[PDB]
Design an enzyme around this catalytic site. Structure first.
Site: not given
Ligand SMILES: *Cc1cc2c(cc1C)nc1c(=O)[nH]c(=O)nc-1n2C[C@H](O)[C@H](O)[C@H](O)COP(=O)(O)OP(=O)(O)OC[C@H]1O[C@@H](n2cnc3c(N)ncnc32)[C@H](O)[C@@H]1O
Ligand SMILES: *Cc1cc2c(cc1C)nc1c(=O)[nH]c(=O)nc-1n2C[C@H](O)[C@H](O)[C@H](O)COP(=O)(O)OP(=O)(O)OC[C@H]1O[C@@H](n2cnc3c(N)ncnc32)[C@H](O)[C@@H]1O
Ligand SMILES: *Cc1cc2c(cc1C)nc1c(=O)[nH]c(=O)nc-1n2C[C@H](O)[C@H](O)[C@H](O)COP(=O)(O)OP(=O)(O)OC[C@H]1O[C@@H](n2cnc3c(N)ncnc32)[C@H](O)[C@@H]1O
Ligand SMILES: O=C1[C@H](O)O[C@H](CO)[C@@H](O)[C@@H]1O
Ligand SMILES: O=C1[C@H](O)O[C@H](CO)[C@@H](O)[C@@H]1O
Lengths: 577, 577, 85, 85
Positions: B506, B551
């Site tokens: 991420h 996310n």
């Protein structure tokens, strides 16, 4: 999809594609079904290792293999987990969990056996080793004339080698390959020969090899198409083939029942000729689900009247493995022609050789590579170029040493963590034993338990036979220990070991070939025709009835070619319309 | 391939495909290049988990993920192997081996960071979680009007959700999902809300979910074609994009240098508009190789004049993980409405419920499933149906709990051996922290060492910042321990732990967005245009400049939509010719 | 006897935990020791009776090939001395 | 030695250990030395090894010894998983 074809083929692995290549070419209207789906990119059924990225990251391809090997029969798990929290739900028994097969004796299994359900089958990931079998390992195609038998096998193997693009030249300029092969060749005093593993592959550049696959054999594109306007071929992925329908006399197949996995709908397909090439496990499963052999736990008191040898006499090879770290002596041998002066990294360091000198042990191409590597990479302590291809060495099965050998680098068992030992030093050793066919060694299918496709659950009852097979397996282990020592010591964490039974994926004899159903305890004849049936053929390693150590796929392909000849001799293609 | 397009896009991940969907639709002549190849079957760039076989064998998909995660920066290995044989070649130093990066401090790395080089990028394997960011996590698109900023983000997120087919309904009939969600909802006393993870996915049947991907966003078929006869799009796989060519003023890009990996040949491609969507690492690499920022080891004494914030302020999320085994109390709750008499497997055993009774805690659909499972599978000790879908639960990031949560079953870390504990009992916990952007946290590229594509080797200089980021990360761990306990105890072998830095994938802020290059220490403006350049745009998580726990992909897609609006407002498509 | 400095990378510590910047001398390690030129398995026993409080008790004689000379130029005399001892 | 930690799954009556011990040539370069700065737990100069098995006869014999154990052990049974050569 039509309801009528000349030929239907179940399975799009390399053996099903052998039937497609031969029969589509000969003008038959062909349909092929596979339970799995189009995977490999736009070349349908191609080798998944043929991406630029995998060949730059070969350590990662193990994961691709593992991701498409689905275990055949997993026994009920009896591991004790007694450190659960008191609040967590805790089992009182070892109940059937997580896809396990309660029919399976964990002590009589092929636990490593697995299947691959993708278009192209296992040929989308395989190692591409395609040796021939010598007489000792090979079934007879001609009964009482060894020269005629030899000539038939030579013809078939030569054609199969063409289909697969088998060669023995693709690794000739590898320093590592040479180092290993040359040492072993000199140490066996002329009595064991070493050569390159025959590989189904074409080198495209010094760092890219186009590995062969089902796609090599047949491109799996629907026809007619621009390149083949008079051919007729349709591939239907995501179709589970469930049952062939026998007539009353067990002389003809009248239909194939299929299950479209996308729509969920079921259909029946008519053909003149039915060919089952679903793998050694799943051919057997499909036949048993169709009323051949015996469903459920074997019982001799009530032995099957239809194909009684189906699922008996199964063979799987013993497999021993280790890796080695190249000896100091061999590494020094790489640079034996060099004059080396000074200390690496220092002003006065040099590495030179005399081109064309008679005292040189290596040719100039070798010494140029070594010199340039040593001078350009003085931070690196090895004389082997970074991009040097892997070794690909074998001494083939012989009477005195009745096992196949591979002395190589395989994409399997890279594992998970980076190697601490330099990869240029590492060589894999895989020796493969032959297993005697024995009636007691069986693949059977549950009458209650079902697999993920709602088909009868496969169950093994297997032990390596106690006599010759076992003696040879242990002698084979010893031979690997002795031979590998000539190259280097074992790599810690890859010490000599037997692999889990069936992990080798060379299962044979599940639907075995012979001349006479009763005398030879078999299921198909030498045309791969199921005894008694006019129009049902089986292809694959399940046909091979002998104890073999070498990799079976080329032999299975050769048998399929012969079977196609029979079909061409006995069935007329429909008019192109 | 043409030498001139209206728009060139580097990368065929979901963000590159956002640009393709918007700009191909608007009539631009578009080319897209990807270094990787067509993988996913005939739906180009689709999710590899969308095979019937994977959804019947979900435990195997971990392998597919692992097979396409290539580590970004691996430090030199210093493991001591002292059990080599005396004959084996043995190192005298810990030299550079096996692709390791000698620039990398192993103690300041994102060791888990990896990249995926296949058409469709990481969207061919991702988990499909697409939450929105709340204000606290989100960069501003409007500077001094929070309502206007909210309205802009709502519009963009709603469109992105449509592109991805995001929904929150696909797991509503799962008993396991309900069991977990209902318990947590009741235990947090109204102060934390639990809902389904927003998932980019469409359910097709009770046992098949069509997971979204790049292909969902844009099908990647070349155009014109029958369905889109007036569109113009070409995808070129196996093309490494190496350099954009700046003019002298750093006001325009004049060309893209590409390397065809199949032929080996190099070319230059002209476009009006250049869009870099190669991922947070590889966008940065391509820019640095093009003269942006600073090549080599950072040195403040000579800080770069062009895009000085490039590769600084990088963020990666802390990630904590465990699994739990469902509590006895929760399992008994599944069957709380049942009257159970007798012993399973015995003649007199029965399980009944009263349809529609007011005292029932569950609706009839639930009790029917439970009754039928309990009566039809008396060998099974659990009340949960075998095919029950997995839990997909979250409480989203809030000020009081500044981390994202997923309480679910992920395809990652199944591992290698079968679970001994029944899968129906197992729940994964993943909590994701936000990381403060700090100038000292860098992604830089070696001026000597090169990667497998002969491009400057990425190197991290990263530590989680010591203050809020670290306090929150540890508080997050505690929160997972506390919350998970409400569901069950930890599963042995999946105890609470921090995952390797970067394994979460991420990474953000490598080419970050803001309003003013200097004031906001940034590289692109709110149209994702590189400061100073008329015709260069960057897309992806590298644009996100904030500390975020959720996310990032949906947010990155939303930014890309906004960027496409700018392009449509400022560049005219060429005549269709 | 001699344990080299440890260089195992532990990168899954919590962000709050104190984290090393170098592979410093820790936990009794010997910074003089090259880990690649060690007898890492060598150990000593400090108890009355020494290692004979735990040993396997295998006591073979050495043949001439393995054995130092006690008599320089008379193999029979050397043999007789070793046999007696 | 090396029973280890977990109970054997294979019946103990079946299990045989193999230990083969090589001879090592004395070489001047193979040393035991003591630090002039670092001290052990008894405040005595810290032992340090500088050792490699010598490259010639010692190493050839060591590898031949491994092979001999592999060959000889095979006459008795196969290797026990987890206790491979
Ligand atoms: C996995 C593997 C295999 C392998 C190997 C290395 C690995 C990791 N290395 C080899 C080597 O070096 N040399 C060699 O000769 N073999 C090697 N192998 C084994 C080789 O891949 C197999 O022997 C060969 O692929 C067998 O070919 P075959 O065509 O007979 O079978 P298949 O590849 O398994 O394909 C069968 C197809 O049938 C489909 N299927 C199965 N059941 C059904 C049903 N009911 N309905 C419809 N289709 C079905 C499968 O999906 C598969 O595609
Ligand atoms: C791997 C993964 C990722 C993931 C996840 C689970 C896993 C196992 N779960 C996620 C989730 O639930 N929610 C979410 O928001 N993200 C999740 N992710 C991450 C997600 O996949 C990525 O954030 C997203 O894919 C990023 O998209 P983007 O389009 O920006 O980048 P990409 O997918 O990495 O694709 C980049 C493409 O560029 C090509 N490439 C790279 N370098 C070059 C050069 N030099 N030339 C040409 N092409 C290049 C790559 O090959 C790739 O295809
Ligand atoms: C540990 C071991 C050893 C062993 C063996 C199996 C094991 C697990 N099996 C053997 C076998 O089958 N056959 C054989 O010949 N040897 C085997 N060994 C080795 C054997 O135990 C030793 O070779 C033997 O014990 C050596 O005897 P020695 O009397 O020379 O030395 P020691 O037993 O190590 O005792 C030395 C004593 O000195 C004390 N000490 C050390 N430093 C000091 C100082 N500075 N001051 C005062 N005392 C000191 C030690 O405490 C020890 O008690
Ligand atoms: O045929 C083979 C078997 O099926 O797989 C082994 C490991 O990949 C291969 O090394 C071997 O070639
Ligand atoms: O976005 C995510 C990250 O990139 O991967 C985790 C494990 O697959 C996922 O659980 C999570 O959704």
């Amino acid at each position: 999809m039509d309801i009528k074809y000349d030929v239907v083929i179940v399975g799009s692995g390399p053996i099903g594609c052998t039937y497609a290549r031969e029969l589509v070419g000969a003008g038959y209207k062909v349909a092929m079904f596979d339970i799995g789906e189009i995977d490999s990119g736009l070349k349908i059924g191609a080798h998944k290792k043929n991406t630029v990225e995998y060949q730059k990251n070969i350590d990662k391809f193990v994961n691709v293999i593992q991701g498409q090997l689905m275990s055949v029969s997993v026994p009920v798990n009896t591991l004790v987990v007694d450190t659960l929290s008191p609040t967590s739900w805790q089992a009182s028994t070892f109940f059937v969990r997580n896809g396990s097969n309660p029919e399976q004796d964990p002590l009589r299994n092929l636990s490593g056996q697995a299947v691959t359900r993708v278009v192209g089958g296992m040929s989308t990931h395989w190692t591409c080793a395609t040796p021939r079998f010598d007489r000792e390992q090979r079934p007879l195609l001609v009964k009482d004339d060894a020269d005629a038998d030899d000539a038939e096998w030579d013809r078939l193997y030569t054609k199969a080698e063409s289909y697969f693009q088998t060669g023995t030249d693709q690794f000739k300029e590898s320093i590592r390959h040479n180092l290993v092969l040359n040492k072993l060749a000199e140490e066996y005093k002329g009595q064991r020969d070493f050569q390159q593993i025959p590989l189904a592959a074409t080198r495209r550049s010094p760092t890219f090899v186009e590995w062969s696959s089902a796609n090599t054999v047949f491109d799996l594109q629907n026809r007619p198409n621009t390149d083949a306007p008079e051919e007729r071929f349709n591939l239907f992925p995501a179709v589970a083939c469930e049952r062939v329908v026998r007539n009353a006399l067990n002389s003809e197949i009248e239909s194939l029942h299929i299950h479209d996995l996308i729509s969920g709908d079921r259909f029946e397909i008519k053909a003149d000729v039915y060919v089952l090439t679903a793998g050694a496990v799943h051919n057997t499963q499909l036949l048993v689900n169709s009323g051949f052999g015996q469903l459920g736990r074997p019982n001799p008191t009530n032995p099957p009247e239809l194909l009684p040898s189906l699922g008996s006499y199964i063979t799987e090879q013993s497999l021993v493995f280790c890796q080695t770290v190249m000896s100091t002596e061999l590494i020094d041998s790489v640079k034996s022609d060099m004059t080396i002066r000074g200390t690496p990294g220092e002003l006065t360091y040099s590495v030179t050789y005399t081109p064309g000198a008679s005292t040189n042990k290596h040719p100039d191409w070798w010494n140029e590579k070594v010199k340039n590597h040593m001078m350009q990479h003085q931070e690196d302590p090895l004389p082997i170029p970074f991009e040097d291809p892997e070794p690909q060495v074998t001494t083939l099965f012989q009477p005195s040493h009745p096992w196949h050998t591979q002395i190589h680098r395989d994409a399997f068992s890279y594992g998970a963590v980076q190697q601490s030992i330099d990869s240029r030093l590492i060589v894999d050793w895989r020796f493969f034993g032959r297993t005697e066919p024995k009636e007691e060694n069986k693949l059977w299918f549950s009458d209650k338990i079902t697999d993920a496709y709602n088909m009868p659950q496969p169950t093994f009852d297997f032990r390596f036979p106690a006599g010759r097979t076992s003696k040879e397996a242990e002698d084979m282990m010893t031979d690997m220990c002795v031979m590998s020592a000539k190259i280097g010591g074992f790599l810690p964490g890859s010490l000599p070991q037997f692999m889990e039974p069936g992990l080798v994926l060379h299962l044979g004899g599940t639907h075995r070939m012979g001349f006479d159903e009763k005398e030879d305890n078999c299921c198909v004849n030498t045309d791969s025709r199921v005894f008694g049936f006019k129009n049902l053929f089986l292809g694959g390693c399940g046909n091979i009835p002998t104890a073999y150590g070498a990799n079976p796929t080329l032999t299975a392909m050769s048998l399929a070619i012969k079977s196609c000849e029979y079909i061409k001799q006995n069935f007329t293609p429909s008019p192109f319309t």
